[PDB]
């Protein structure tokens, strides 16, 4: 099996060995430098694709170093379409055991090899035999194995009594009280806090601090742990000793958005567990419905992500649909556990929109939609040292303190707070105003919220739900009307016919906005849009927003000038970001439009696959959807770090994973097949027969 | 003849490719056709037994240049020209080899329009390969009697085999290198092979899993040899 | 000339032409002179290509016989790959002798330095060694009791005249395990050997002797 898991892959002549003794001295520098040139023609291809061939590498290290040697001339560790090497190496057959030698030509291919040394002198191989199909794999094909096998790993985690400390342990804090990692356990739960405890006291070098919180956690608590801050507990399950029986706990799994991660965040979670229940990792995207329900259950919303002072801030709410697919996946009805699982994440999804979203202060009262608005007091704390200090003339201590009140202070970190839990941090459609919004973003993911707690209502509570907080009585009826309440309210102060867009509304000043962003299509996610709405939005919208890799987050005349004076934000034109992909994806789906759809995901997944094969395998946070050579290049903000690796990417970063798995299920043989020999949009939809061009909406 | 075709695939897994030869040039002699294998062996062979050759005549050719601009160097460079005068003699005789299979029984007896398409293609090859190195004129007629194989081959490509079929993409790729490295002609080389990649694309879906995947390769190579062309 | 027959071996190497380069190297050893260590790796990389590819297209062509022997009704086919291995052998027996007798006639002959005397013996002893691979009967008997002695003889000098860091006498001590293991079938003895070698260099005192003792603990651990 040439593409078995690299664990796997890595863990006669074949086994003794006798010296190798194959070189003079004189053979590598004797008669000066003498590097082959690449030739041009077909040469060994069929062979390369048919013959099964395979190389014997007698000197893994020596082989890697050659070829850095020669084809790494940056000296990044990684050979790219930038590096300027001859693009061919020799290396020994198998069957000759090394004494002959066939010609690995290419960029991509050399790549390959060298990410296979990497990886196998990471496995302790100092000599091996290579299939040269795992080096010669279709680009398509082999970054859909390494998301699906190895990078969902990679980003998995799981508290168990060995890594708390690890998993705990903070930097973005640089106070005296912050030295130390701590974790923060729910007053009510005394069964984690001893096994906090116990896990401290294993691993005392660490010196892991535990505390239990306060019943009730309030805004002004909060600001009194800025210096002490702490990672949260989230959801556990019972695990004995085989041996003696001896009761511990161990964490339910989550994945973190990227390796340098080790939270569990929120929206990010939802996209992740698509990808993840593709890939059969069901375990992995259930264990964050569990940690979802433990969060509302015990710190009153959904987090940004599990430490102490994000507790006052969410992020954009995707719980219902989360519970739904995963329900599906267990196997729904029929499974027991899926369907208690199902309830208690509906109990926790109609707490959640009651007493966070539809609660004061992110309630408008007068429209009755709903801000991004979070509590919360004072100068935010885990930011760089100096970030706030362009807005600070008098000082942070007496204002944290209340000494001194500001009143156009405290609104511009009320704004700061709530751009932050609108996921969009940063974007010049929030700058200064976005806790004033009513956005078309969390109206239409509260009419899902609506659409899908009547359903559950209907089919799981009888049609007759009662709060166990208020003990009020509602019905399916009840929730589909408050959806339709919704879905004319957004209409009124939002919907703007003439441009087919979905403007957020400003509750302040009471006007709606003109900023032209790719939210809109969130509309059709959640069902709201009317089929002439929807259409108007493809006809006018669309093409404003649909770039060379896809949509970008806003338009270039909405975003405005860049200078100086105004940078670049990392949600505006020209970025590209998955959550956009692909909830417009499937809005468009649910209205007909699946043809363009088709369209959208080819050309978000042309640009992937480009900057994979090019650029060493890489996956980045985010892409420039007008960018046509490296895409991948964003430095924007604090910009990519995706590209820092040597050898082998690791992990990817993972709604971008799951992006590119969910937008390949639109793709047929086709476009999969064009896709693998790197077809642009512009090439692929041009050599279409006119009756093919209709699936791609031309 | 069966005999031979079996000692031919044991060869070439032994890596003895001059023993390949052997037993499929008497398998070329005999009149019957070849199937796709064994055309495939047949080139599989002989261009595994040139390869060795040509990689062996361009390490000696630059060592012989590196040597000539030294000065009093003349006994050196003399041991080198005329050791790489017995690699040329060799290449000759391996071309001039399946040349003259090619011309009095394979090329005459192909009855497919791939069979003719893969025979002149190959014709092609070894009489670019003898432009490679060859001097004076027999530099020139293996010029020439390679642009004619080519054209010859091109022409029955464009009316028996589809745009995406490997031996036509193949065909334009080694066509287009002869372009530019024999003729000269990176204009030529240039649309010759961007017209071949761009004509694949629509067909992708027609090719068997395993004919896809040959395209994919030289298509590759297609794409970075106008990569290089393009500087 | 000397000097052109070493140069136009060191032109065939870099060509890949080892028959080639075993001819001008094996001119250099059968006239005069000692060679230097230069010119003494030459002709050791030259038939260690000849006879390398030789041995790996043997092994494949005989694992490819042993699969196709268990088929139901192939006598045709066995017929035809053990005559096929039978060319092989013939080319491994003639390039061997090739070697050997170079070996006796003019190399350890004319050996003054000590460390010479153990690459000229373990060279004679992996060829002898090489024969025993695939002969059968007396000369098997023959080749593996010449190997044996050889292995012996370049021991008892390395023993006494080269350190245990010496890359010749560990490999030396690696190839002398091999044939214990590979052609004695003394799994034993093969062990022994390796794990005394590895120790008494792990003992003491360049890439090139850990190369080896790295090979040295890879058999162990296969061994065991
Ligand atoms: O007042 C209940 C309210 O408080 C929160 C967060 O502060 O939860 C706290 O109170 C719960 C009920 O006693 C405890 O289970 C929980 O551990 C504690 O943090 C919210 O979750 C809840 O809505
Ligand atoms: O990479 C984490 C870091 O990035 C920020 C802002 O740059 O948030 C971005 O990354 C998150 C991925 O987990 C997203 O959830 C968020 O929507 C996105 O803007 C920081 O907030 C975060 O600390
Ligand atoms: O129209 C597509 C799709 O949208 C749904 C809801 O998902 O209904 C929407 O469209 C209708 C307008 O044409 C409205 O009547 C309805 O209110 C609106 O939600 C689906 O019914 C339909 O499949
Ligand atoms: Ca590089």
């Not at chain 1, 590498?57 to 890697?64: A, G, M, P, R």
């Not at chain 1, 509602?474 to 009307?481: F, I, Y």
């Not at chain 2, 005999?30 to 990689?55: C, D, F, P, T």
Request: negative net charge.
């Amino acid at each position: 099996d040439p593409f078995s898991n690299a664990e796997v892959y890595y863990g006669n002549r074949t086994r003794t060995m006798s010296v190798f003794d194959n070189v003079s001295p004189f053979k590598k520098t004797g008669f000066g430098k003498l590097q082959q040139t690449r030739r041009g023609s077909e040469d060994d291809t069929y062979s390369s694709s048919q013959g099964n061939r395979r190389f014997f590498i007698e000197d893994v290290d020596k082989t890697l170093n050659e070829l850095l040697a020669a084809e790494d001339t940056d000296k990044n560790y990684q050979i790219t379409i930038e590096d300027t090497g001859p693009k061919v190496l020799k290396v020994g057959t198998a069957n000759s055991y090394g004494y002959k030698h066939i010609n690995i030509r290419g960029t991509y291919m050399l790549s390959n090899l060298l990410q296979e040394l990497t990886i196998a002198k990471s496995f302790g191989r100092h000599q091996i035999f290579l299939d040269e199909a795992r080096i010669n794999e279709n680009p398509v094909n082999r970054l859909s194995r390494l998301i699906n096998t190895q990078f969902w790993n990679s980003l998995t985690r799981r508290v168990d009594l060995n890594n708390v400390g690890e998993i705990a342990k903070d930097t973005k804090i640089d106070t005296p009280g912050a030295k130390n990692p701590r974790i923060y356990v729910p007053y009510d739960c005394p069964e984690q806090y001893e096994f906090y405890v116990q896990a401290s006291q294993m691993h005392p070098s660490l010196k892991l601090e535990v505390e239990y919180l306060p019943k009730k956690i309030t805004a002004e608590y909060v600001k009194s742990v800025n210096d002490t801050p702490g990672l949260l507990a989230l959801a556990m399950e019972e695990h004995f000793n085989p041996s003696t029986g001896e009761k511990t706990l161990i964490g339910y799994p989550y994945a973190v958005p990227g390796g340098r991660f080790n939270e569990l965040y929120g929206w990010d979670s939802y996209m992740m567990a698509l990808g993840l229940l593709e890939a059969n990792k069901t375990d992995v995207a259930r264990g964050m419905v569990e940690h979802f329900i433990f969060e509302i259950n015990h710190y009153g919303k959904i987090l940004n992500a599990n430490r102490s002072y994000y507790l006052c801030r969410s992020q954009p709410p995707f719980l219902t649909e989360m519970a739904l697919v995963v329900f599906k996946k267990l196997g729904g009805r029929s499974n027991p556990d899926a369907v208690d699982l199902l309830k208690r994440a509906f109990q926790a999804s109609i707490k959640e929109y009651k007493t966070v979203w539809t609660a004061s202060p992110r309630l408008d009262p007068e429209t009755g939609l709903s801000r991004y608005h979070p509590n919360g007091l004072g100068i935010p704390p885990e930011t760089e040292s100096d970030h706030f200090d362009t807005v600070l003339l008098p000082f942070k201590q007496l204002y944290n303190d209340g000494k001194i009140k500001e009143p156009k202070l405290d609104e511009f970190f009320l704004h700061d707070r709530g751009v932050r839990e609108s996921g969009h941090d940063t974007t010049y459609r929030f700058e200064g105003v976005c806790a004033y919004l009513a956005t078309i973003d969390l109206n239409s993911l509260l009419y899902k919220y609506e659409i899908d707690i009547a359903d559950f209502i209907k089919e799981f509570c009888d049609d007759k739900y009662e709060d166990p907080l208020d003990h009020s009585i509602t019905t399916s009826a009840m929730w589909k009307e408050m959806a339709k309440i919704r879905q004319e309210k957004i209409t009124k102060y939002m919907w703007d016919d003439e441009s087919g867009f979905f403007f957020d509304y400003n509750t302040k000043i009471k006007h709606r906005t003109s900023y032209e962003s790719a939210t809109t299509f969130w509309a059709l996610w959640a069902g709201l849009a009317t089929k002439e709405q929807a259409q108007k939005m493809v006809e006018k919208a669309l093409p404003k927003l649909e770039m060379l890799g896809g949509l970008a987050a806003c338009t270039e005349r909405s975003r405005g000038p860049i200078s100086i004076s105004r940078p670049i934000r990392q949600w505006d034109y020209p970025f590209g970001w998955a959550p956009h992909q692909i909830l417009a994806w499937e809005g468009l789906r649910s209205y007909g439009y699946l043809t363009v759809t088709n369209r959208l995901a080819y050309r978000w997944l042309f640009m992937m696959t480009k900057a994979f094969v090019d650029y060493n395998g890489i996956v980045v946070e985010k892409y420039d959807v007008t960018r046509g050579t490296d895409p991948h290049r964003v430095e924007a903000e604090y910009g990519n770090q995706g590209a820092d690796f040597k050898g082998a990417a690791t992990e990817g970063f993972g709604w971008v994973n799951a992006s590119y798995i969910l937008g390949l299920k639109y793709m047929n043989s086709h476009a999969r097949r064009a896709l693998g020999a790197c077809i642009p949009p512009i090439s692929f939809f041009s050599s279409l027969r006119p009756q093919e061009r209709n699936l791609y909406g031309l | 003849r069966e005999d031979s075709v079996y000692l031919a695939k044991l060869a070439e897994q032994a890596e003895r490719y001059e023993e390949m030869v052997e037993n499929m040039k008497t398998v070329a002699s005999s009149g019957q056709e070849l199937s796709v294998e064994e055309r495939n062996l047949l080139s599989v062979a002989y261009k595994n037994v040139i390869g060795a050759r040509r990689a062996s005549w361009r390490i000696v050719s630059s060592i012989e240049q590196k040597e000539e601009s030294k000065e009093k160097s003349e006994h050196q460079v003399e041991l080198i020209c005329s050791y790489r005068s017995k690699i040329e003699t060799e290449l000759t005789k391996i071309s001039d080899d399946i040349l003259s299979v090619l011309d009095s029984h394979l090329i005459p007896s192909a009855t497919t329009g791939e069979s003719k398409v893969f025979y002149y293609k190959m014709k092609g090859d070894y009489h670019r390969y003898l432009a490679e190195f060859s001097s004076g004129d027999a530099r020139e007629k293996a010029t020439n009697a390679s642009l004619e194989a080519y054209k010859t081959a091109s022409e029955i490509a464009t009316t028996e085999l589809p745009p995406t079929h490997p031996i036509r993409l193949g065909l334009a790729l080694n066509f287009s290198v002869f372009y530019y490295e024999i003729q000269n002609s990176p204009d030529k080389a240039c649309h010759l092979a961007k017209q071949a990649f761009d004509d694949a694309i629509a067909e992708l879906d027609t090719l068997s899993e395993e004919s896809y995947k040959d395209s994919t390769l030289i298509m590759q190579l297609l794409r970075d040899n106008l990569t290089l062309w393009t500087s």
